[PDB]
Structure formats: structure tokens, C-alpha cells
Amino acid sequence: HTSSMRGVYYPDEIFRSDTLYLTQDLFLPFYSNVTGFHTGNPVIPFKDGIYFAATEKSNVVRGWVFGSTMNNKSQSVIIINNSTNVVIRACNFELHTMIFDNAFNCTFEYISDAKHLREFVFKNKDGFLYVYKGYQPIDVVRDLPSGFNTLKPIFKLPLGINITNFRAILTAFAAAYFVGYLKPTTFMLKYDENGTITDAVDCSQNPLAELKCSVKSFEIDKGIYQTSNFRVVPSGDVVRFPNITNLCPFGEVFNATKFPSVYAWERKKISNC
Amino acid sequence: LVKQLSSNFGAISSVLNDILSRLDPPEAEVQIDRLITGRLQSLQTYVTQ
Amino acid sequence: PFQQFGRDVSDFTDSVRDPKTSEILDISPCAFGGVSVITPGTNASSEVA
Amino acid sequence: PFQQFGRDVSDFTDSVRDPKTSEILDISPCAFGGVSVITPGTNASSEVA
Amino acid sequence: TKRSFIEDLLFNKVTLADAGFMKQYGECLGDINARDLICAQKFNGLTVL
């Protein structure tokens, strides 16, 4: 129910030697709050970052339908794997059965044919769908086990689609989601030999992590080290106007002793008040 | 250092919140960059001293 | 009575009478500074201050 | 396999797979530096290195 | 006072600290033992530790 140091993927395709690189585009901070529907039920969560790490043995969940509002309003991406064949369709609508609903406007047809834990992270940035994959042999059935599980990118098909929801899970089944949202934060990756990270630090949870990210070191010695500067965000707002800033002649037509007749009504001009 | 703080470095003015609401944001970015460069030079001189 | 606002020695606005009413002093600077981390060693413990 | 190119600690390009075929290492920084003239003295010599 | 007459004379002739220019920078001067510590700040951000 908590992403304890889980969801660390390669932000780019750059190979780095033994060093300590500082990543800014990395997401999924450590010790987050995931929403696992340990029941499988079709739900429509939010988007702009997810962490699907279903730990169900004998994986039945093999398809996700990304896109937008259904009922033929926008395009939808339907990634489905049937008999070791990853059919990545992104043109079907909703008016194994949702694919043959309607085929009014289809484009970009791409079929790639050829316990258990399969982790996936989807990212949409500037019209680019980044898909990662990771495997880790686990045995517990309670929740997300501990570990790192370095993710591996598999597909980078943009499709130019602004995905906003995902639903339509498989049926005829235990099946959970364990999906967790992400926020833009900074990370410090330990690029070791052979292109293996194996260790990361999220500089947003504890001052110790921020200090480790500041000096670019995983082992901190004893002593005081200045890290950053704090600022107090203003809460309220106070705007005061020059007392009355002028008025307008009104006390003369309502507090007078004499008034003309109806046919001889006076027209007084009032301006710049 | 205080006098160089409240001093212009080749811009419209030396006081913030004035060059913002008098031109376009792209036009004011140049003045902001000039002021930041001047402040950085003054602070570097102060640090060297 | 004629003075509307007032500045400090650093050429920064110190106080100003309320344009509305109840003529009194005004803004004082807020809290700021450099936050530091005290670590007794990673091999020793993992708590900071 | 998924990595295309790679940089060094100094944020400079160090190696990249060959796009055509035979994915291997790539360029290294060329020879550079500054020259210096070894002069024993013009008054008693005329050869340098 | 836990000092001597010579130390008291030294602390009463050079501790002027340019009386009148303390308003430039901010300082958390005072004392904690007598409960008279005042933590002052300025908009220029210049502090003295």
C-alpha cells in the first residue's frame, strides 16, 4: 500500500559510468500512497502519471485502455497482449469486445507479435507515451514487496494522443491494481557499471535525503552542511484604499426644501464623481 | 554592497515591480537579466573582497 | 502629517500610514535564511535536525 | 541494448552506438594543449625545442 | 560582569560598532540568559552570524 523505494526508471537513453547523476524529470517519489483495488473491478482513475505494479501470480490482467471520454468522443489507446503478441492499437472506440465496437476513423496501426510481478509506468510529455517494464520474483500476497526493481523501457510510441483515463480491465477471473500517482520531484541516481542504477534517493521526503542530494554523496560525514534556503509563503492579502477617494453630490436632491413641478423638472449634470 | 544593491546596471530602473508593469514580458526579461547580471557581479566582487 | 510612506537606511520601504484610517506603522520583514542539516554520520544513525 | 548514446561525468558526449550496424564504442577527445619554447638563451644559443 | 577592569575598559572604547549603521544589515543580537534576545531581519538579506 506504500511505494517504498519503488518506481525508478531510466529518464533517458544515456549510458553513464560510475558517478552520481542528478535527475529532475524523474517521478514517483519514495513512500507514496497507492490505491490498490484488491478485490478486479473496472474503475476509472486519474492520469498524468501512474505506477501499475500488480503482484498477482498467474497474471490474467493483460490489457489497458488509455484515452479520453468514451462513447465516441475521442481516440483511445488499447494495448492488449494475446498469446505473446503485444497488439498496440490506438484507434478503437467504445461506441476483447471493445475493439470491434467501431472503426470510423483509424490510423497508426502497429502490431508487435512474437509469483509474477510486471511493473509498468506510463508518461505523457509533449505528446510522447513512455512505457517501462520491470520484473521481480516475489512470494508474498499481502501488498507491494520491498525492493528496487529497476525499470526498463520497451515502447516509446507517441501517437499524439492526450490520454486522460484508463479502464476496461479483463474479466472472468485475485486481481489488483496497486496504482500510484506521481509528482514532479528531483532524484539522485547512482549510475554504476554496466548501466545499473540499483539505488536512488528522492530529495523531497526528509532533510537527510535533500542533504545527500546536495553534496552528491550517499555516505554523509558528521558535521553541519548548508543545503538550501527557506521562504515563508504569504497566506492572506491586505489592500487598503485612500479612505473614500472622493464621493458624489447626492445629499442635495434628497434633502432639499423646495422642488419644481413636473413640467418644469430641472436637469442637473453630474460627472467625474 | 547595499549601495550597489539599490543601483541600476544599465536598465530602465533599479527598483523591482516597476519594469514589470510597463512593457511586455519578453521585453522585461532582458532588463531582468541585466539586473540579475549586475547583482551577481556586485556579489562576486563582495565575495572576493 | 505630510509624510505618507517611509523608507529605511537601505533604501527599502519601512512603514507607511494606512490609506484607509487608523494611521499606524506598516510592514516588517518576514522570516528567511539558510536552512542547514545536522547529521551525526550515515554509518552512525539516520536522524537529522 | 535500449541505450543509444552515452555521456561522461563532465556532461560531454563520450560514446554512441553505430546506427548502421556493428554497435561499438565511439569518438575520444583529440589531442590539444599549449605549446612552450625551450630556449637556453639567445645570447649563447640559437636552437629551441 | 565576569571580566576585569582592563577588559571592561576595552569593551567600552572599541565596541561602538559604527553606531548608526546597524540598520543596514539584520542581526539576531541580544542574550538568551536574560531573556532579551531579539531576532531582527532586513529586506536586503545581509545577516551577521
Side-chain angles (χ1 to χ4, degrees), chain A residues 1-94 96-273, chain B, chain C, chain D, chain E:
Chain A
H1 193 61
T2 302
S3 179
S4 180
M5 299 181 300
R6 301 177 61 89
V8 180
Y9 54 90
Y10 294 92
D12 44 60
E13 316 295 336
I14 307 176
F15 173 78
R16 307 181 186 273
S17 180
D18 302 332
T19 182
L20 293 82
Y21 179 77
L22 182 63
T23 305
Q24 183 66 23
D25 201 11
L26 236 176
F27 299 142
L28 218 293
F30 297 158
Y31 298 91
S32 300
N33 299 330
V34 303
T35 306
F37 303 94
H38 181 270
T39 58
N41 58 91
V43 76
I44 310 99
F46 204 69
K47 270 216 79 282
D48 300 71
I50 47 180
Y51 173 69
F52 186 86
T55 66
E56 303 292 339
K57 80 286 179 300
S58 180
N59 180 85
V60 184
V61 183
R62 55 189 61 179
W64 22 78
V65 181
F66 295 92
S68 180
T69 307
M70 53 181 179
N71 296 278
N72 190 21
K73 294 185 178 60
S74 180
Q75 291 76 9
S76 181
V77 185
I78 303 186
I79 301 179
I80 177 63
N81 177 85
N82 181 87
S83 300
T84 68
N85 302 328
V86 187
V87 184
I88 303 180
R89 297 182 62 91
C91 83
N92 305 326
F93 300 92
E94 299 183 5
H96 187 60
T97 60
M98 298 300 180
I99 164 182
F100 301 102
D101 293 339
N102 282 319
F104 288 98
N105 301 120
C106 186
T107 179
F108 205 94
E109 180 68 23
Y110 176 82
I111 167 179
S112 60
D113 56 77
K115 305 180 63 185
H116 295 351
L117 167 58
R118 41 185 60 180
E119 302 182 7
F120 300 93
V121 170
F122 298 88
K123 177 189 301 181
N124 181 87
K125 185 262 300 180
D126 300 0
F128 291 97
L129 178 58
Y130 303 93
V131 182
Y132 300 90
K133 187 180 181 300
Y135 185 86
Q136 180 180 181
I138 80 284
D139 56 76
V140 72
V141 303
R142 299 181 59 89
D143 60 330
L144 298 177
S146 180
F148 203 83
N149 188 92
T150 61
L151 299 176
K152 309 295 295 300
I154 44 179
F155 297 94
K156 199 183 61 180
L157 285 313
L159 262 302
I161 296 180
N162 180 269
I163 48 185
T164 55
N165 293 120
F166 61 97
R167 55 163 284 97
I169 203 181
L170 200 59
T171 178
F173 55 91
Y177 292 86
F178 296 150
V179 51
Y181 302 99
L182 44 83
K183 288 84 60 180
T185 50
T186 174
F187 283 82
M188 181 180 60
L189 300 177
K190 178 189 289 295
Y191 284 90
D192 209 12
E193 67 277 337
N194 306 331
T196 60
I197 305 179
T198 332
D199 192 4
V201 170
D202 175 67
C203 339
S204 62
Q205 53 179 1
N206 300 120
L208 179 60
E210 190 180 359
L211 178 60
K212 295 161 65 67
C213 299
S214 61
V215 302
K216 303 299 180 300
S217 180
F218 283 76
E219 193 277 336
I220 306 301
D221 300 330
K222 52 182 302 300
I224 295 178
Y225 308 94
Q226 193 276 341
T227 303
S228 297
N229 305 91
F230 59 95
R231 286 300 175 271
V232 180
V233 180
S235 302
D237 176 66
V238 172
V239 177
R240 305 304 290 242
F241 293 117
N243 204 238
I244 72 280
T245 325
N246 302 300
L247 278 327
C248 203
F250 286 145
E252 301 293 337
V253 295
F254 293 102
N255 300 270
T257 177
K258 57 180 60 60
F259 286 88
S261 300
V262 190
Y263 59 93
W265 54 273
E266 299 292 338
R267 175 57 64 91
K268 182 167 59 64
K269 180 181 300 300
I270 303 97
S271 180
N272 299 329
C273 93
Chain B
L1 187 59
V2 170
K3 289 191 298 296
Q4 254 64 25
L5 174 59
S6 60
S7 180
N8 197 331
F9 296 93
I12 301 300
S13 62
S14 60
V15 182
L16 298 180
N17 300 330
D18 288 71
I19 61 179
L20 283 311
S21 299
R22 62 159 52 101
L23 288 176
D24 226 65
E27 301 179 359
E29 282 180 0
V30 181
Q31 313 295 337
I32 292 180
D33 294 330
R34 292 297 182 89
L35 292 180
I36 290 180
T37 303
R39 299 286 174 80
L40 286 179
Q41 292 180 2
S42 61
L43 195 50
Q44 174 186 348
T45 306
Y46 173 80
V47 167
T48 302
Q49 294 181 359
Chain C
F2 62 93
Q3 291 175 341
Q4 179 68 209
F5 60 95
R7 287 190 171 95
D8 202 0
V9 195
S10 300
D11 300 70
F12 289 148
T13 300
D14 191 9
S15 300
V16 50
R17 281 186 172 95
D18 329 48
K20 211 30 225 30
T21 178
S22 67
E23 320 302 85
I24 52 180
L25 289 94
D26 211 68
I27 155 189
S28 60
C30 303
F32 67 97
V35 46
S36 300
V37 182
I38 301 180
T39 300
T42 304
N43 192 26
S45 180
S46 60
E47 53 182 0
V48 298
Chain D
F2 69 99
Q3 293 173 329
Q4 180 68 209
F5 60 96
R7 286 187 171 93
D8 201 359
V9 190
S10 300
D11 300 70
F12 286 105
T13 301
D14 180 71
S15 298
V16 51
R17 283 183 162 94
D18 189 76
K20 178 184 301 180
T21 180
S22 68
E23 294 78 10
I24 53 180
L25 277 308
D26 205 72
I27 68 155
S28 60
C30 302
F32 63 93
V35 301
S36 300
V37 180
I38 308 299
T39 301
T42 310
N43 181 85
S45 179
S46 60
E47 301 292 337
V48 293
Chain E
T1 171
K2 49 182 81 285
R3 295 186 301 269
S4 62
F5 187 79
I6 301 180
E7 296 181 4
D8 291 330
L9 263 53
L10 293 183
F11 276 87
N12 293 330
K13 197 176 182 178
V14 83
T15 56
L16 44 89
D18 298 69
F21 296 153
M22 301 180 180
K23 301 299 297 180
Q24 296 284 358
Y25 58 91
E27 56 180 359
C28 194
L29 80 167
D31 40 61
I32 180 183
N33 56 272
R35 301 178 60 180
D36 299 328
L37 185 66
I38 165 180
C39 232
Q41 291 169 142
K42 297 296 167 54
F43 299 93
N44 49 82
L46 282 71
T47 58
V48 173
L49 306 182

